[PDB]
Write an enzyme that holds these catalytic residues in place. Structure first.
Site, PDB file in Angstrom:
ATOM      1  N   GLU A 174       0.788  -1.230   0.000  1.00 21.10           N
ATOM      2  CA  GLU A 174       0.000   0.000   0.000  1.00 21.10           C
ATOM      3  C   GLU A 174       0.819   1.279   0.000  1.00 21.10           C
ATOM      4  O   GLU A 174       0.443   2.259  -0.638  1.00 21.10           O
ATOM      5  CB  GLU A 174      -0.944   0.039   1.210  1.00 21.10           C
ATOM      6  CG  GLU A 174      -2.079  -0.960   1.153  1.00 21.10           C
ATOM      7  CD  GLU A 174      -3.058  -0.680   0.023  1.00 21.10           C
ATOM      8  OE1 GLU A 174      -3.456   0.492  -0.150  1.00 21.10           O
ATOM      9  OE2 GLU A 174      -3.446  -1.623  -0.686  1.00 21.10           O
TER      10      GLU A 174
ATOM     11  N   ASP B 224      -7.624  12.432  -7.383  1.00 18.89           N
ATOM     12  CA  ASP B 224      -8.517  11.421  -7.931  1.00 18.89           C
ATOM     13  C   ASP B 224     -10.000  11.747  -7.770  1.00 18.89           C
ATOM     14  O   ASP B 224     -10.852  10.867  -7.914  1.00 18.89           O
ATOM     15  CB  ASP B 224      -8.205  10.051  -7.318  1.00 18.89           C
ATOM     16  CG  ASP B 224      -8.228  10.059  -5.796  1.00 18.89           C
ATOM     17  OD1 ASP B 224      -8.378  11.143  -5.185  1.00 18.89           O
ATOM     18  OD2 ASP B 224      -8.089   8.961  -5.211  1.00 18.89           O
TER      19      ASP B 224
END
Length: 259
Positions: free
Chosen positions: A37, A55
């Protein structure tokens, strides 16, 4: 090491009572999840992780990808995280708004989204400060539990599995690909993993099915996906299902280059 300090006293009681795993086991699980991650084994630094990843989901915060919300994320988990913090701080009527006020953040809940008016510098600067706040750590874990862990533990218990490796693998899957819904989620993969009552066999099968969809660009950049599941499968082959006294093994299985 002393994994316990990476949590909080209350958080450990909560995790032990609801997942049956201890501080060392959860610490090991977090190392394995944080490698793919954030490419960093020092996961406690991410309690205060805050960033706008451009995003359209607002700010990404914490250990499990919670967002504050945006045009492309109208059901974020960020508000739940903040409400949990307000609760951990003792509010009788906890709320995301109450949390932002305590923190002196100029923001409010607008619908199911958090509308932040402060700059990223100011907002994330305040979040960074919470890294060693016991109440924030507690809120972080309670929310991580409600969003991904509870379901993962339930799936394991339903099958009579309670090992640290099984729970950790299910959690990594839910976090990375989603808990329920499509065929690519934890739910979907389990439906195609067979019915073996042998934990090792089941997990070997599960990992094989996960490997087929894990590298789909939306989840991971190949071959990072294949590598993240390989970590768990290796522990199964080595028989280290309990994830206790495995410091060197963990160092070995996370020894791979991201991308």
């Amino acid at each position: 090491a002393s994994p316990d300090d990476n949590f909080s006293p209350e958080t450990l009681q909560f995790l032990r009572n609801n997942t049956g795993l201890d501080g060392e086991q959860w610490n090991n699980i977090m190392k394995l999840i944080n490698k793919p991650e954030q490419d960093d084994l020092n996961w406690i630094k991410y309690y205060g992780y805050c960033e706008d990843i451009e995003d359209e989901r607002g700010y990404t915060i914490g250990l499990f990808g919670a967002t504050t919300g945006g045009s492309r994320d109208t059901h974020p988990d960020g508000p739940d995280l903040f409400k949990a913090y307000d609760a951990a701080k003792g509010a009788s009527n906890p709320s995301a708004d109450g949390a932002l006020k305590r923190l002196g953040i100029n923001g409010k809940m607008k619908g199911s989204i958090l509308e932040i008016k402060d700059s990223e510098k100011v907002f994330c600067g305040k979040i960074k400060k919470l890294q060693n706040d016991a109440a924030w750590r507690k809120a972080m874990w309670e929310t991580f539990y409600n969003v991904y862990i509870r379901y993962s533990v339930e799936q394991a218990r339903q099958r009579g599995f309670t090992s640290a490796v099984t729970i950790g693998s299910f959690v990594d899957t839910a976090l990375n690909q989603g808990a329920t819904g499509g065929s690519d989620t934890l739910q979907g993969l389990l439906a195609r993993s067979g019915s073996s009552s042998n934990e090792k066999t089941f997990m070997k099968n599960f990992h094989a099915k996960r490997t087929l969809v894990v590298d789909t660009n939306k989840y991971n950049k190949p071959p990072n996906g294949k590598n993240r599941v390989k970590q768990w499968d290796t522990l199964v082959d080595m028989g280290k299902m309990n994830l206790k006294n495995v410091d060197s093994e963990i160092a070995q299985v996370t020894d791979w280059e991201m991308k």
